């Protein structure tokens, strides 16, 4: 049971990283900004700063506070 769970979780992580990597590749060499004018996908890049900044805020919030609670208990 332990082997199967660890195995499939690691494969899941690899697959997710690969999905995002191939999405980056698609943006690099397959995206056509003229064919996606005002498209949903184009609007993803239009407000990329907001996405990245709020993701950074969530990451910092979680990390700061979880690590702080762990160190407080320690």
């Amino acid at each position: 049971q332990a082997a199967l769970y660890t195995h499939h979780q690691y494969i899941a992580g690899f697959l997710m990283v690969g999905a995002f990597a191939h999405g980056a590749i698609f943006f690099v060499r397959d995206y056509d900004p003229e064919a996606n004018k005002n498209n949903v996908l184009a609007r993803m890049l239009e407000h990329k700063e907001a996405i990245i900044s709020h993701l950074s805020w969530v990451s910092l919030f979680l990390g700061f506070h979880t690590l702080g609670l762990y160190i407080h208990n320690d």
Binding site: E49, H54, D74
Partner: protein, 741 residues
């Protein structure tokens, strides 16, 4: 009179105007911050005097006064140590019963429950147990009272004030001219004859008149209360004649030449004092007296103002052979016209000397009751080993800096430096081969032993009960040192150290020092040490030699000492500067010293430190599991790290809990360093761009634009955090493993 005192009066005006203009020293930073990088630069170029002025005189005056400031800081540190001993320590109780009382000179305010860190050291006292061996040092000095410690602290504070005033005066009021600094002969004469000669002579006088009688009375069992004050040993000669009945004769034997009459307190017995477990004080007195004589003699070697003496310029020019062209022609100019060269030599020597001190102090415990203080011995050894490694790598770095900046080919034509630079390829290739050979053979011995032990083929390993690799040369040297007393050192009663051979010196049922047997495990670990040292030397020497140019970058010197790269061309040109070679050499030095400290700790716990019974039976801390378990990597992982890490992990809820917390924190910082070490600057710059957009969207935007750390700064921060994490992890590990005792 060629050697003369030259100064400039009122060299620099004293005012606070500059204090409000950060970055004034450098021309680039004086324009104010445009981005945050400026900030970092201001802390990185603060002490880079050579890059702030083109005149050597100004750099020399800055270095002199900065050294005065460092002396002031050191004196303040000594004052603090002595004051905390006098007011916050159990020094008196430890004096009365040194074996049972645990040294401690730090107390914690109870504010959050941290008062648990106040251990039950003893002597009706609670505090943090110290491992700096200050109590043993003070006892060796015959302190025997806290008034003396208090006055020692006051004197240290006054000396710190004097050092600060001297720095201020010698910069802003009377700054010596450059010609004053460029006196190597006079400086060496004065530092050898007086600083080191008369320093030894004065300390020998102190020992003869203060430390010797007081320590002899203490060893006899006299309570510190009944011991007369040290000044009482200077007024009535008879009071000392009772202890050493040679003062009765006085100083007349000294001048008559009958020095043999002083053998009462100037001995050469060697070995260790059975009572205190340290070196005999008379032996140290004779030692320091002989060193004082030698240093005073050596301080007259160089010519200063009277014809007699040695001219080091001629001395160097004279030594040249067929294989080395012009010989040591031009080295005197190098060492009297560039502080980086001198700093390289001095740092290398100081580091090697610190490591030698670490090796010698454990083998022959110099202070009373320091041998059985296992916590102090380990702490001192590891501390001085780390200091030595850092100093060696710093010497390498400053040699590289000299090569980049102060190296002038015109003045170095076909001399030793020129020739070394001209067969650098051969040097580095052969050092690379020897490093690979050492690594392969030494580490593959461990891998082979591990593989055979995993396969059940114990008879095929490199162990004592298997294929044997006995360090025959080291054993032969040990035997010769054992036989030296009476044959090659006839006037020495006992061997220099009991490590080589002899009885088991134990104090209070604890094994202070005993012979150390060398087996196949010692052979393998010594060759591991040699491998790591050779690799570190490879990295640092390669950084020094290829600092100016290479087959990749023929003009590396123009790029400076530390630069990130020269672009992705020619394949890739990352970490091509000498600074990056120092950056890697620091990692390898840390690795090698970690191995050295693990070897020392495990060997001493398994083979030297322990307990004795009234009969004489020996029981070591780990039961002598080093011989059959230090020969495999799994053995080190299990019997040393996993087994001896029990104290740290289980220290919660006791006075050592701070060590567990620091263990975890050091792990955290070490892992944190990898963020800087692996990642690059572009990612972080783009992330900061997004964060800056977020700030700007709310009309929050610093005028000082944020910037990701420069590539060089990224590497420096990663390395600094890596070293801090590793050092702290081992610090907590050793201190908690050796304080649960």
């Amino acid at each position: 009179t060629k050697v003369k005192i030259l100064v400039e009066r009122d060299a620099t005006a004293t005012s606070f105007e500059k204090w409000a203009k950060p970055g004034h020293f450098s021309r680039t930073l004086a324009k104010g911050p445009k981005t945050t990088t400026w900030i970092w630069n201001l802390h990185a170029d603060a002490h880079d005097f050579d890059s702030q002025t083109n005149s050597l005189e100004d750099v020399s005056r800055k270095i002199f006064s900065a050294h005065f400031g460092q002396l002031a800081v050191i004196f303040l540190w000594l004052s603090g140590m002595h004051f905390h001993g006098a007011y916050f320590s159990n020094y008196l109780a430890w004096l009365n019963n040194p074996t049972s009382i645990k040294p401690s000179a730090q107390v914690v305010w109870p504010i959050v429950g941290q008062e648990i860190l106040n251990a039950d050291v003893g002597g009706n006292f609670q505090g943090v147990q110290i491992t700096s061996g200050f109590f043993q040092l003070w006892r060796a000095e015959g302190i025997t009272s806290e008034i003396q410690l208090y006055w020692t602290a006051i004197g240290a504070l006054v000396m710190s004030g004097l050092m600060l005033f001297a720095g201020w005066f010698h910069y802003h009021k009377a700054a010596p001219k450059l010609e004053w600094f460029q006196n190597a002969e006079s400086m060496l004469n004065h530092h050898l004859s007086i600083l080191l000669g008369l320093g030894c002579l004065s300390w020998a006088g102190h020992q003869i008149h203060v430390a010797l009688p007081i320590n002899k009375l203490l060893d006899a069992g006299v309570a510190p209360q009944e011991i007369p004050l040290p000044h009482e040993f200077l007024v009535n000669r008879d009071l000392i004649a009772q202890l050493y009945p040679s003062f009765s004769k006085g100083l007349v034997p000294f001048f008559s030449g009958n020095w043999s009459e002083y053998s009462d307190f100037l001995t050469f017995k060697g070995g260790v004092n059975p009572v205190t477990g340290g070196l005999w004080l008379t032996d140290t007195a004779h030692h320091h007296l002989a060193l004082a004589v030698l240093f005073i003699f050596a301080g007259h070697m160089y010519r200063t103002n009277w014809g007699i003496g040695h001219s080091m310029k001629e001395m160097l020019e004279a030594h040249k052979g067929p294989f080395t062209g012009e010989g040591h022609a031009g080295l005197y100019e190098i060492l009297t016209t560039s502080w980086h060269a001198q700093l390289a030599i001095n740092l290398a020597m100081i580091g090697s000397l610190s490591i030698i001190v670490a090796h010698h102090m454990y083998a022959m415990p110099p202070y009373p009751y320091i041998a059985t203080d296992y916590a102090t011995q380990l702490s001192l050894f590891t501390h001085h080993v780390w200091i030595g490694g850092f100093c060696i790598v710093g010497g390498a770095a400053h040699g590289a800096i000299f090569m980049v900046r102060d190296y002038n080919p015109a003045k170095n034509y076909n001399n030793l430096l020129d020739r070394v630079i001209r067969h650098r390829d051969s040097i580095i290739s052969h050092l690379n081969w020897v490093s690979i050979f050492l690594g392969f053979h030494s580490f593959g011995l461990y891998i082979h032993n591990d593989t055979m032990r995993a396969l059940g083929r114990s008879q095929d390993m490199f162990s004592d009960t298997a294929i044997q690799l006995q360090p025959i040369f080291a054993q032969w040297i040990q035997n010769l040192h054992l036989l030296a007393p009476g044959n090659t050192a006839p006037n020495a009663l006992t061997t220099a150290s009991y490590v080589f051979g002899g009885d088991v010196v134990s104090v209070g049922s604890k094994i202070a020092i005993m012979p150390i047997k060398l087996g196949t495990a010692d052979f393998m670990v010594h060759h591991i040490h040699a491998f790591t040292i050779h690799v570190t030397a490879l990295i640092l020497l390669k950084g020094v030699l290829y600092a100016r140019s290479s087959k990749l970058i023929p003009d590396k010197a123009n790029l400076g000492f530390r630069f990130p790269c020269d672009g992705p061309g020619r394949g890739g040109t990352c970490q091509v500067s000498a600074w990056d070679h120092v950056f890697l050499g620091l990692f390898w030095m840390y690795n090698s010293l970690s191995i050295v400290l693990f070897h020392f700790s495990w060997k001493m716990q398994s083979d030297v430190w322990g307990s004795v019974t009234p009969t004489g039976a020996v029981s070591h801390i780990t039961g002598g599991n080093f011989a059959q378990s230090a020969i495999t990597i799994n053995g080190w992982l299990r019997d040393f790290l996993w087994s001896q890490a029990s104290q740290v992990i289980q220290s919660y809820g006791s006075a050592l809990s701070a060590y567990g917390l620091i263990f975890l924190g050091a792990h955290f910082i070490w892992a944190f360093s990898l963020m800087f070490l692996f990642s690059g600057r572009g990612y972080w710059q783009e992330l900061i761009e997004s964060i800056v957009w977020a700030h700007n969207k709310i009309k929050v935007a610093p005028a000082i634009q944020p910037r990701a750390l420069s590539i060089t700064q990224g590497r420096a921060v990663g390395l600094a955090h890596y070293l801090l994490g590793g050092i702290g992890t081992t610090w907590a590990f050793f201190l908690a493993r050796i304080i649960s005792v």
